[PDB]
Enzyme design. Structure first.
Site, PDB file in Angstrom:
ATOM      1  N   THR B   1       0.857  -1.222   0.000  1.00 52.02           N
ATOM      2  CA  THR B   1       0.000   0.000   0.000  1.00 52.02           C
ATOM      3  C   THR B   1       0.872   1.244   0.000  1.00 52.02           C
ATOM      4  O   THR B   1       1.877   1.303   0.698  1.00 52.02           O
ATOM      5  CB  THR B   1      -0.949   0.025   1.222  1.00 52.02           C
ATOM      6  OG1 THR B   1      -1.847  -1.088   1.146  1.00 52.02           O
ATOM      7  CG2 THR B   1      -1.780   1.305   1.286  1.00 52.02           C
ATOM      8  N   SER B   2       0.475   2.231  -0.791  1.00 48.47           N
ATOM      9  CA  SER B   2       1.144   3.527  -0.829  1.00 48.47           C
ATOM     10  C   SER B   2       0.047   4.570  -0.769  1.00 48.47           C
ATOM     11  O   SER B   2      -0.810   4.629  -1.655  1.00 48.47           O
ATOM     12  CB  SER B   2       1.972   3.701  -2.103  1.00 48.47           C
ATOM     13  OG  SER B   2       2.815   2.589  -2.319  1.00 48.47           O
ATOM     14  N   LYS B  33      -8.926   2.619  -1.313  1.00 46.16           N
ATOM     15  CA  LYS B  33      -8.341   2.792   0.021  1.00 46.16           C
ATOM     16  C   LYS B  33      -8.573   4.191   0.590  1.00 46.16           C
ATOM     17  O   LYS B  33      -8.150   4.480   1.717  1.00 46.16           O
ATOM     18  CB  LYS B  33      -6.840   2.517  -0.039  1.00 46.16           C
ATOM     19  CG  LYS B  33      -6.484   1.171  -0.648  1.00 46.16           C
ATOM     20  CD  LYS B  33      -4.981   1.000  -0.738  1.00 46.16           C
ATOM     21  CE  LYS B  33      -4.617  -0.339  -1.353  1.00 46.16           C
ATOM     22  NZ  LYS B  33      -3.154  -0.583  -1.238  1.00 46.16           N
ATOM     23  N   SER B 129       3.513   0.451   2.982  1.00 43.33           N
ATOM     24  CA  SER B 129       4.773  -0.210   2.647  1.00 43.33           C
ATOM     25  C   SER B 129       5.570   0.545   1.593  1.00 43.33           C
ATOM     26  O   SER B 129       6.789   0.665   1.704  1.00 43.33           O
ATOM     27  CB  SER B 129       4.503  -1.635   2.154  1.00 43.33           C
ATOM     28  OG  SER B 129       3.615  -1.637   1.048  1.00 43.33           O
ATOM     29  N   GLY B 130       4.877   1.065   0.585  1.00 41.74           N
ATOM     30  CA  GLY B 130       5.517   1.801  -0.492  1.00 41.74           C
ATOM     31  C   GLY B 130       5.996   3.197  -0.148  1.00 41.74           C
ATOM     32  O   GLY B 130       6.689   3.814  -0.953  1.00 41.74           O
TER      33      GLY B 130
END
Ligand SMILES: *[C@@H](CS(C)(=O)=O)[C@H](Cc1ccc(CN)cc1)NC(=O)CNC(=O)[C@H](CC(C)C)NC(=O)[C@H](Cc1ccccc1)N=[N+]=[N-]
Ligand SMILES: [Cl-]
Ligand SMILES: [Mg+2]
Ligand SMILES: [Mg+2]
Ligand SMILES: [Mg+2]
Ligand SMILES: [Mg+2]
Lengths: 219, 196, 244, 231, 241, 240, 204, 243
Positions: B1-2, B33, B129-130
């Site tokens: 996910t970013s 999201k 995470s990104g």
């Protein structure tokens, strides 16, 4: 298991295989995996089978009571919420993995519900051990706003992919087509495998088994 | 996910990728999201999808009931409700949430709530995470009081890079613009952002 | 506060009587007469229905005679709803006993249990007692055939023949006059119906105003059988005994 | 009349009769006096005996090193409320390393008494209390009524014939407030005040009870031959 | 005669506390009216600010329960607010549990079922209020549902509540007897409000200024109350024809 | 707030009467007439839609309620009390029965469960009895068609036909004359419409009458309960 | 350690033409130690039969529990429970211990008294229903039974043909399992007669 | 009759007599007032000096809730304290969850719902206080008054207790003579005067004036007590106006 659903032009098409396994053994070759929630909403079930059955039945029961009190057809979002909030509460210990599809006052809706309480709202979904095989078919051939018989074929084709390529999946293909004007529960839609034919008769003749004692009681 | 939220002159913009993975399998490639907790208070979600969905629904409920009684809640109030849930249930949650909202008094505001349940008010925030891959880029390229087009480009470039390097991120770049003018949803496809 | 409205259902009168029990017994005295008669080879339960219209569906109707298990039945006199609460409790106690000991509950143990429940409503809780009197007809392999009664006080006693509900005074005299210890079921059937026929407040005793039952060991291979009589069967036994 | 069966019922003139009856129990209690200067605060209490064989009922209770009270009315209720004060004083010390302010102690007593006057089943407290103390803002004297009304005063009295002591203090106000750094002269003024509420009986050695708290004086009670000095 | 103090049956089969709660209903001396348009539901109510010291902006018996649902109360304000807070709470909990906005009638029935409980359980008194719920429901369209202290509820084509309810009711009855339809055949809510006010003026025989009325309007996806100036514009239009 | 009413509000009077039950029955007496008739191939239940105002939409007020697909209920007496019994009857039919056995309860058992709830309001602390009498009509596989009455006491009785509320004494006499054990469902509906006309003062049509049936399955089965439409009633009123 | 294979034993059920058959072995052990050769695993509640394999304390408990429930069912309903209804009762009862289950493998067998339709069913330990027409197997030699049943079985067998099929399926499966055997019982169930036969088999 | 013997019982009128009897206790109490000004509120109260032994300025009646709300009441003083304790719990739980300090209308309903709850059951007594309260929030100044029934409204001015009619008349003059509004320092002076004028109804005993105020400019929107020179300036203004 291989279960899938698509959103087509007029509504929802759900699909499922029919193999119920205990470990490596097949206990039932024609097991129904498409479950009634309400008259306009159905649920395909994968994961732990008892959890899938009892979760759909409980939410179906509660939606029936809800629908009697409100006097109007239940919505897919309320089915989705009631499943979701319960599964979340139990933190994944209820291993219910559902494809929830139905048609509301607000139109057709399709969800995937996971054991932990997450849900995705999608135009097509797949679940069970044959999800990758089925999803390959959808990524290959899905398009939005399909006609009914086309969508039926795509879902059937996606379930078939699971049946053959996934060992956990097998048996027949069940479909459920939901639109504003009808509900078609097709069981079985297809029989892709013939039952294996046996070449001998191995059944014993009467008096072959050794009996010690016998008792007869009438009713 | 970013995910990211960025304040600018006219308000604030939230941005997110669309990939949800189960290990290496992309379960959902078109995930939304960016979720709405009030008219002009939205949040970016990262962490457990079940947890961030469950939280966002509870927040929406609290702010709906706040609105019934006390009128439109501030962005700060929304962030406080998120925080309260995340902090008090830190042992059972995996949620990294960015809260972004537009008041007329306060204008654009961005609050980030990392794993601990702490709250941090920032001009912009990155998460997921990104995000690791774009701390350098974002720090070098962010300015305050950017125009809408500049902020759309800043988010587009940033998440483009986050997506490029992070396997857990990908798909489309969704954005939600929050200004006095209203709520605008934007989408940007791979063929557009990959060639940047 | 609330004290103002409290009837105080669990107090003594100055004479040492429980008001509500006494008044519940008064309630029961107006209920349709129920009779139990114990013979050497079985028990008879007979009971009179009340008010009846021609439109009451009699064959699917049960207001008087209830089954607790395969060995024990009860005849009711009083509030039918109150009885059904107690009946479902009794039915559970019999199965709990069966589950625990793998033997059918002895009749007296079940009776004591129910009677203890009734007692509790008279001593604590501030609730009205159950406006019910039971005749228990049952069999077990310790005492054989047994008749008991209980009333709202929670007192229970054993009987050879007994009545509850309306006209018990008159009914008990007529039973005491014609009952004998060597009597048989067929004779007790006749005595029960004759007693109701004389004590009834109706003009005549007919099949549609009666519930009737027998607990006989009179079965093949010495096993106890409960027979809840059907409307047609009650009509036949009324002709047999010569009442209609 | 019809509105005195319990504490939960207002009369038609807005009165709480059970509270007023509890208030009556105080008037039947033995007299006690409170008074203070800027440096010290004093309790004086006329203890009551059942007969000549009996002991004289203790009137003064210590709540902490810097606080305590005298009682008039139901002694068991004074025990309940004093125990409650002891706890609140103790909680302040343990949790905050802080001596409980006398004003805050009053507020706590008020609110405890109040709960008994608004709820069904209970009853008001049947006792009045005079709380003295020395805290961070100097000497203090409080009067507690079981209605809930707590009142900070220079001096007061409660119990039977307490009006006589209360008038005396009202005249003496300008004198006794100035008795700073002299405990014995402040006690004298309290003993002289309580004397105005006596009839027939006079202050004997096992009759009188005195307590004092101040700047460099912990709350200490004087009974028996300790108070003979002041008779 | 304690059968008149608590909610138990009198020998006649009557609950006097319920009946006396109905009488508390008119203690405000305010009349409300509700009508339905094509696209809207309009509720108007008398506004009386007798004290000059009152902040007139805070004197209201109309409540915004959810975004779609409005509720006008006939009865004392403490019980009105009791009912308002609960109806809001119920509407929010509903949306959370079931994922869609609580319908007007479902709320009405819910509040009615609560009211019923106070008529059967002795420790709880009935609320001395009549609750008129309004919305433009997404399934049923313009909706008026009313609850009372008995726990009764029913849907309405139009309704009126208060001391002079019978006059307003008959005035409305007579209009719908002419038109032969269940609603005000009008496109704009502005004109449905003008109708509501006009028919209250005729029925009560009193003229209104902008501060004598209080107006609530339900449309699709929002319920809102009109400001004094919005009502003044409404009154100007009525006078000009 | 302490619910201090932990004691019965229904107690035995010196005569043996339970006052509150009798008074609840008086409330039922004042209520509008409803009736039930059992045929060989169905049951019918009917009542008057006594509209409280002409501005009220009486379609929104359902006096005749579906409890299960094969069971229906109607009442006389206090409407709000009936409504909460229907809610509880519907729920208990799922919790204590359908979720256990995977099928709907038979008429008699659902009746027994409702009766239990009503009995408990007659003995539990701090409640009055329900001010309704119910007429429950239903079908199940092993008992067939049945019709039950349930009173505020919790007592229930099975009926071939009966009526409750306002003009029940007169209506029951009317039914006694007309009823036989060879009635078809249409004959029972005809008799219900005749019997109900006597107790109705004002307008008598499909809009002012509520009438439902337990009959054949309407297309795992179809539901036997069916509420007759305003048009379907009016059609039968021309053959009246 | 594995509760489902401490005590051992098997149950199999089959349908035939207007009949069902259910059969079980007689062994109860503590793993390797044989304890009882008279531990029957088939019970009946009216005309509905219930086989139960698995942990013997739970077998006993569930028998006692279903006797209890079906007795109250009969008193209330005024009729004996049917196989279809009982199956749902078993499922419910098992699933209500979802997170502390009975370590059992129940098997329902019977004929619906009204329709006359032969019925069998099986369950996992948490109540998921295997609803198969052909045959249901359970226990420590379930795999062995699956194999035997799949090759021996055919539809619409007459009662005494079916007897030979189910018996040979049981016996030969049991003899390939260390924890099954020590005797066997076969019920042949028809609409209004039930024949119970004890089988002669090797006692090792 | 008997309808007045139990709280939460409707008389045949539709009235709750126990609440109306609570009002009598309120009417029996000392005079308290509230004045809404340009950017805030002013509270003032009559404190009867029963005796010379009362310590001056010590027995404080006006209570603060959170840091921005002032509460004053007439009637049974402990009941008022009980209500403020609850108000503090409400204001605390609001701030804990929503971060922002509780708005005045929000706070008003919190007290309102709680007082109303004490008219719903016979096991509790209604509150023997009318409570005047308010402060400054994000939407500006707010003054409220809350009665034993649970009724409350917003006010320009408010007054309760034995001298309420006197006070109300004075408040009505201020409302008429200042449509553009009153300043915070003016409202303090006027509050002093109005308590002094309303003291004619309690004229037997002499009294002590207590004033508090929240004002956006004068106190930064926080509740403070009027002390020292500003208090003496208000007393002097009040004493001049009565003479
Ligand atoms: C496929 C799911 S999968 C392998 O993840 O793709 C099917 C889905 C399914 C849906 C609906 C039904 C019918 N209601 C049946 C299947 N699921 C399975 O095959 C999972 N299988 C089961 O749950 C077994 C059912 C038996 C009747 C064969 N049960 C078991 O395997 C239990 C599982 C279990 C074990 C311990 C604790 C909880 C559950 N094992 N045993 N005994
Ligand atoms: Cl409800
Ligand atoms: Mg990528
Ligand atoms: Mg009540
Ligand atoms: Mg072997
Ligand atoms: Mg061996």
């Amino acid at each position: 298991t291989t279960i899938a659903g698509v959103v087509y032009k007029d509504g929802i098409v759900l699909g499922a295989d029919t193999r119920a396994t205990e470990g490596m053994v097949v206990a039932d070759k024609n097991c129904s995996k498409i479950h009634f929630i309400s008259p306009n909403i159905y649920c395909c079930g994968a994961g732990t089978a008892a959890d899938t059955d009892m979760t759909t039945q409980l939410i179906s029961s509660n939606l029936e009571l809800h629908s009697l009190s409100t006097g109007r057809l239940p919505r897919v979002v309320t089915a989705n919420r009631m499943l979701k909030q319960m599964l979340f509460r139990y933190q994944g210990y209820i291993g219910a993995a559902l494809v929830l599809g139905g048609v509301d006052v607000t139109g057709p809706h399709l969800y995937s519900i996971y054991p932990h309480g997450s849900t995705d709202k999608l135009p097509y979904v797949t679940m069970g051990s044959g999800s990758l095989a089925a999803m390959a078919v959808f990524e290959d051939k899905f398009r939005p706003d399909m006609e009914e018989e086309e969508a039926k074929n795509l879902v059937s084709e996606a379930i078939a992919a699971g049946i053959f390529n996934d060992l956990g999946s097998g048996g027949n293909i069940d479909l459920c087509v939901i639109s504003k004007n009808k509900l078609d529960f097709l069981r079985p839609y297809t029989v892709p495998n013939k039952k294996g034919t046996r070449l001998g008769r191995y059944r014993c003749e009467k008096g072959t088994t050794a009996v010690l004692t016998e008792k007869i009681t009438p009713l | 996910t970013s995910i990211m939220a960025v304040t600018f002159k006219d308000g604030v913009i939230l941005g997110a990728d669309s990939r949800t993975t189960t290990g290496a399998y992309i379960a959902n490639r078109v995930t939304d999201k960016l979720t709405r907790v009030h008219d002009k208070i939205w949040c970016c979600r990262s962490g457990s999808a079940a947890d961030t969905q469950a939280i966002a629904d509870i927040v929406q409920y609290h702010l709906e009931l706040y609105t019934s009684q006390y009128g439109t809640p501030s962005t700060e109030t929304a962030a406080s409700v998120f925080k309260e849930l995340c902090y008090e249930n830190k042992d059972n949650l995996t949620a990294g949430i960015i809260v972004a909202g537009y008041d007329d008094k306060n204008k654009g505001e961005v609050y980030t709530i990392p794993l601990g349940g702490s709250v941090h008010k920032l001009p912009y925030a990155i998460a997921g995470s990104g995000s690791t891959f774009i701390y350098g880029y974002c720090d070098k390229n962010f300015r305050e009081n950017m125009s809408k087009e500049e902020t759309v480009d800043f988010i587009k470039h940033s998440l483009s890079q986050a997506i490029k390097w992070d396997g857990s991120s990908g798909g489309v770049i969704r954005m939600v613009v929050l200004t006095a003018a209203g709520v605008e949803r934007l989408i940007f496809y791979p063929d557009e952002y990959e060639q940047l | 506060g609330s004290r103002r409205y409290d009837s105080r259902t669990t107090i003594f009168s100055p004479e040492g009587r429980l008001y509500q029990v006494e008044y519940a017994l008064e309630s029961i005295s107006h209920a349709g007469t129920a009779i139990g008669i114990m013979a050497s080879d079985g028990i008879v339960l007979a009971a009179e229905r009340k008010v009846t219209s021609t439109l009451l569906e009699q064959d699917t109707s049960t207001e008087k005679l209830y089954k607790l298990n395969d060995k024990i039945a009860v005849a009711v006199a009083g509030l039918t709803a109150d009885a059904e609460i107690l009946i479902n409790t009794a039915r559970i106690h019999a199965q709990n006993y069966l589950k625990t000991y793998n033997e059918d509950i002895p009749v007296e143990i079940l009776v004591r249990r129910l009677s203890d429940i009734k007692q509790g409503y008279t001593q604590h809780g501030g609730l009205r007692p159950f406006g019910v009197s039971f005749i228990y007809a049952g069999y077990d392999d310790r005492y054989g055939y047994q008749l008991y009664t209980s009333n709202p006080s929670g007192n229970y006693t054993g009987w050879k023949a007994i009545s509850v509900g309306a006209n018990t005074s008159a009914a008990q005299t007529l039973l005491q006059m014609d009952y004998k210890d060597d009597m048989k079921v067929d004779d007790a059937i006749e005595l029960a119906l004759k007693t109701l026929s004389k004590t009834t407040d109706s003009s005549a005793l007919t099949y549609d105003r009666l519930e009737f039952a027998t607990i006989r060991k009179g079965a093949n291979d010495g096993e106890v059988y409960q027979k809840i009589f059907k409307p047609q069967e009650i009509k036949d036994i009324l002709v047999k005994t010569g009442i209609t | 009349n019809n509105y005195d069966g319990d504490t939960v019922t207002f009369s038609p003139t807005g009165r709480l009769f059970q509270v007023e009856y509890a208030l009556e129990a105080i008037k039947q209690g033995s007299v006690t006096v409170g008074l203070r200067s800027n440096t010290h605060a004093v309790l004086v209490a006329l203890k009551r005996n059942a007969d000549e064989l009996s002991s004289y009922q203790k009137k003064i209770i210590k709540c902490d090193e810097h606080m305590g009270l005298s009682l008039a009315g139901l002694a068991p209720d004074a025990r309940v409320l004093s125990n409650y004060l002891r706890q609140q004083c103790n909680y302040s010390s343990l949790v905050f390393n802080r001596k409980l302010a006398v004003e805050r102690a009053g507020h706590l007593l008020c609110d405890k008494a109040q709960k008994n006057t608004q709820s069904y089943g209970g009853r008001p407290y049947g006792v009045g209390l005079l709380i003295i103390g020395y805290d961070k803002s100097g000497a203090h004297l409080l009067e507690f009524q079981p209605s809930g009304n707590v009142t900070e005063l220079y001096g007061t009295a409660i119990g039977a014939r307490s009006q006589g002591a209360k008038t005396y203090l009202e005249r003496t106000l300008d004198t006794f407030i100035k008795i700073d750094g002299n405990p014995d002269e402040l006690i004298k003024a309290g003993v002289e005040a309580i004397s105005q509420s006596l009839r027939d009986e006079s202050l004997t050695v096992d009759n009188l009870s005195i307590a004092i708290v101040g700047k460099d004086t912990p709350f200490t009670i004087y009974d028996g031959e300790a108070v003979a000095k002041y008779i | 005669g304690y059968d008149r103090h608590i909610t138990i049956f009198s020998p006649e089969g009557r609950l006097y506390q319920v009946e006396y709660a109905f009488k508390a209903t008119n203690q405000t001396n305010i009349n409300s009216l509700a009508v339905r348009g094509k696209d809207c539901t309009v509720v108007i109510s008398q506004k009386k600010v007798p004290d000059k010291l009152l902040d007139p902006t805070t004197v209201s018996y109309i409540f915004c329960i959810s975004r779609t649902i409005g509720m006008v109360v006939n009865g004392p304000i403490p019980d009105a607010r009791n009912a308002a807070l609960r109806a809001k709470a119920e509407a929010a909990e509903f949306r959370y549990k079931y994922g869609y906005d609580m319908p007007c009638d479902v709320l009405a029935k819910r509040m009615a079922n609560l009211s019923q409980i106070y008529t059967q359980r002795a420790y709880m008194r009935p609320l001395g209020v009549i609750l008129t719920f309004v919305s433009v429901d997404e399934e049923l369209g313009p909706s008026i549902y009313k609850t009372d202290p008995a726990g009764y509820y029913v849907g309405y084509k139009a309704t009126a509540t208060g001391p002079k309810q019978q006059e307003i009711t008959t005035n409305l009855e007579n209009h719908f007897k002419k038109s032969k339809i269940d609603h005000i055949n009008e496109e704009s809510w502005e004109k449905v409000v003008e109708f509501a006010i006009t028919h209250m003026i005729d029925a009560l025989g009193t003229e209104f200024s902008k501060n004598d009325l209080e107006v609530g309007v339900a449309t699709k996806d929002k319920f809102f109350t009109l400001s004094a100036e919005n009502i003044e514009e409404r009154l100007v239009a009525i006078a000009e024809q | 707030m302490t619910d201090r009413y932990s004691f019965s509000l229904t107690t035995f009077s010196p005569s043996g009467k339970l006052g509150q039950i009798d008074y609840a029955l008086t409330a039922v007496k004042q209520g509008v007439t409803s009736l039930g008739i059992k045929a060989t191939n169905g049951v019918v239940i009917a009542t008057e839609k006594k509209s409280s105002s002409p501005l009220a939409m009486s379609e929104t007020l359902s006096k005749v309620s579906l409890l299960t697909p094969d069971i229906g209920a109607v009442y006389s007496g206090m409407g709000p009390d009936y409504r909460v019994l229907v809610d509880k009857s519907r729920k208990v039919a799922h919790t204590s029965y359908k979720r256990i056995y995977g099928e709907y309860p038979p008429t008699k058992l659902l009746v027994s469960e409702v009766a239990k709830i009503m009995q408990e309001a007659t003995q539990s602390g701090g409640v009055r009895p329900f001010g309704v009498s119910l007429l429950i009509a239903g079908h199940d596989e092993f008992n067939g068609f049945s019709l039950y009455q349930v009173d505020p006491s919790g007592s229930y009785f099975p009926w071939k036909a009966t009526a409750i509320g306002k003009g029940s004494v007169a209506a029951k006499t009317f039914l006694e004359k007309r009823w036989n054990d060879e009635l078809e469902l249409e004959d029972a509906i005809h008799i219900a419409l005749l019997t109900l006309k006597e107790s109705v003062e004002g307008e008598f049509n499909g809009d002012t009458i509520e009438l439902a049936i337990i009959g054949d399955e309407n297309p795992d089965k179809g539901p036997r309960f069916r509420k007759l439409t305003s048009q379907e009633i009016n059609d039968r009123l021309e053959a009246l | 350690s594995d509760p489902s294979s401490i005590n051992g034993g098997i149950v199999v059920a089959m349908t035939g033409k207007d009949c069902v058959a259910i059969a079980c072995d007689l062994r109860l052990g503590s793993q390797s130690l044989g304890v009882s050769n008279k531990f029957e695993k088939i019970f009946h509640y009216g005309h509905v039969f219930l086989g139960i394999t698995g942990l013997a304390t739970d077998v006993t408990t569930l028998n006692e529990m279903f006797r209890y429930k079906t007795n109250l069912y009969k008193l209330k309903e005024e009729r004996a429970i049917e196989p279809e209804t009982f199956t749902q009762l078993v499922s419910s009862s098992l699933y209500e211990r979802r997170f502390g289950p009975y370590f059992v493998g129940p098997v329902v067998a019977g004929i619906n008294s009204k329709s006359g339709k032969p019925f069998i069913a099986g369950f996992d330990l948490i109540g998921c229903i295997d609803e198969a027409k052909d045959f249901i197997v359970s226990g420590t030699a379930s795999d062995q039974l699956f194999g035997m049943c799949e090759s021996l079985y055919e539809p619409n067998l007459e009662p005494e043909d079916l007897f030979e099929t189910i018996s040979q399926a049981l016996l030969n499966a049991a003899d390939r399992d260390a924890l099954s055997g020590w005797g066997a019982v076969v019920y042949i169930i028809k609409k209004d007669e039930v024949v119970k036969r004890y089988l002669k088999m090797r006692q090792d | 009759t008997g309808y007045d013997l139990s709280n939460s019982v409707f008389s045949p009128d539709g009235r709750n007599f126990q609440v109306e009897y609570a009002v009598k206790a309120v009417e029996n109490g000392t005079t308290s007032i509230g004045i809404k000004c340009n950017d805030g509120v002013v509270f003032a109260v009559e404190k009867l000096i029963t005796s010379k032994l009362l310590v001056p300025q010590k027995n404080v009646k006006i209570q603060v809730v959170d840091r921005h709300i002032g509460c004053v009441y007439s009637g049974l003083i402990p009941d008022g304290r009980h209500l403020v304790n609850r108000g503090r719990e409400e204001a605390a739980s609001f701030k804990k969850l929503y971060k922002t300090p509780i708005p005045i209308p929000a706070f008003a309903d919190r007290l309102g719902q709680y007082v109303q709850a004490h008219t719903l059951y016979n096991s509790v007594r209604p509150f023997g206080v009318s409570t005047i309260f308010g402060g400054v929030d994000k939407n500006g100044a707010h003054l409220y008054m809350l009665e034993p029934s649970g009724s409350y409204w917003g006010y320009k001015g408010a007054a309760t207790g034995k001298g309420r009619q006197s006070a109300k008349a004075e408040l009505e003059k201020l409302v008429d003579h200042h449509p553009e509004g009153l300043s915070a320092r003016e409202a303090v002076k006027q509050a002093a005067k109005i308590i002094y004028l309303a003291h004619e109804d309690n004229k037997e005993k002499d009294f002590e004036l207590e004033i508090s105020w929240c004002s956006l400019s004068e106190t930064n929107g926080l509740h403070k007590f009027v002390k020292g020179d500003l208090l003496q300036e208000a007393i002097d203004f009040a004493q001049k106006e009565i003479n």
